[PDB]
């Protein structure tokens, strides 16, 4: 309630800041893990104290039947349990000048994660749960960048936008794809 409150008002107050700042999104963070990844020989362990202390929000997509934690920032380990939100983003919550880009693998052998992300099309929709506050998106573009290239990862002034980034091609992931979605009104047929 309070909690949800005072949390998400933060989060609104620094994506204020970062919408009045030169943003340089984190790519260099995500890059890193993703290389990490292809060579590790380790599994991660849970503490689950330390996630939930992470975790900004929960993304769902139905079209993939897919339920995920957001984490407030980018690291392998949060990597291995849910998705992250690349570092110099928006934290999703919503508003004009907002672009959160979260960020996940495309599968690590213990978890499914956005393996089923690619399929998604143009008018599918995802949703945040973020605070007091449930906020639907709709797919809108799919794009193939360079994991250098950090432009269509800014904020669009006057946009509210959500991109899901991960890896492409398949078990090569010398690229990034973006399924960016835009903001819709939330309505009592989507709970339900």
Not at 58 to 84: E, M, N, R, Y
Not at 89 to 94: F, L
Not at 116 to 144: E, T
Not at 145 to 167: A, H, K
Request: net charge positive; proline share 5%; glycine share 6%.
């Amino acid at each position: 309630q309070m909690v949800l409150r005072r949390e998400y008002n933060d989060y609104q107050q620094k994506n204020k800041q970062l919408a009045a700042s030169q943003q340089v999104p984190g790519v260099a963070s995500f890059n890193h893990a993703v290389n990490d990844q292809g060579t590790a020989k380790t599994a991660a362990k849970r503490n689950q104290q330390i996630l939930t202390r992470q975790t900004v929000a929960q993304l769902t997509i139905p079209k993939i039947g897919l339920s995920l934690p957001v984490f407030d920032h980018t690291s392998d380990w949060l990597l291995q349990f849910g998705a992250c939100l690349l570092d110099g983003t928006s934290y999703p919550t919503g508003g004009k000048n907002t672009h959160a880009v979260i960020s996940a693998h495309r599968g690590v052998p213990n978890a499914e994660l956005f393996t089923r992300v690619p399929a998604l099309k143009k008018g599918d929709k995802f949703f945040i749960s973020i605070g007091n506050h449930k906020l639907a998106y709709q797919v809108f573009k799919r794009q193939v960048i360079e994991p250098s290239d950090t432009r269509q990862l800014r904020i669009v002034p006057g946009q509210d936008l959500v991109t899901l980034m991960t890896c492409t091609p398949y078990m090569i992931n010398s690229h990034r794809l973006l399924i960016t979605g835009r903001r819709i009104p939330y309505v009592k047929a989507d709970e339900e």
